[PDB]
Amino acid sequence: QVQLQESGGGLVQPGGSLRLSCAASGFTFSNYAMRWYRQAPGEEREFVAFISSVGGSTNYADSVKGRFTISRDNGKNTLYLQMNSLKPEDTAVYFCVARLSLISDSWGQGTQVTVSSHHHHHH
């Protein structure tokens, strides 16, 4: 079975960083362009970043350009999203996304990112 499993989410102070990972399994990862999407409560899901199969080409939503970096390891079959200078508006579930053909895809279940100055009340 094709599986995508995100991790690296957390509750973090504004200005901080996170690094999401997505462990891919059950398909030849290096043959496919990969994406990150995100979805805030009550909002529609939105494009975050795209990386070509080999990883040389990338592009980003305007809102995260210059702060986020998408990258991939084609031996570990893992996709990454390095997130710097985080803001409350980045709060959302983040999804790893594989388009497997023109008409099929697979989505991870997502990892929760919350950016809030109240982080220290939960630990």
Add this chain to the structure above:
Amino acid sequence: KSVFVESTIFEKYRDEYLSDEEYRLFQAELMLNPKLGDVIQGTGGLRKIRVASGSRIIYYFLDEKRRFYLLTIYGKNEMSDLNANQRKQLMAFMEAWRNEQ
């Protein structure tokens, strides 16, 4: 417009390639000429059209009820490889999708 029916795939990824304004333009273009896009042989009448600012859209025009099925959208050199098995799958996706409508 009820003239355009987006597949779940088309709807997920459209915004990566087209602003609302670019999309409405595309819709106006097809309404003006349904046969705009080139036919993809082996697929039972699916059509492929290029779009700038590029990317590609594959659609089916149902002439009986004047309706467009938008199957998918993608960038050049991204998923642009099309074999015989992939043509068959587009058909299956299509024929399954269009039977109930």
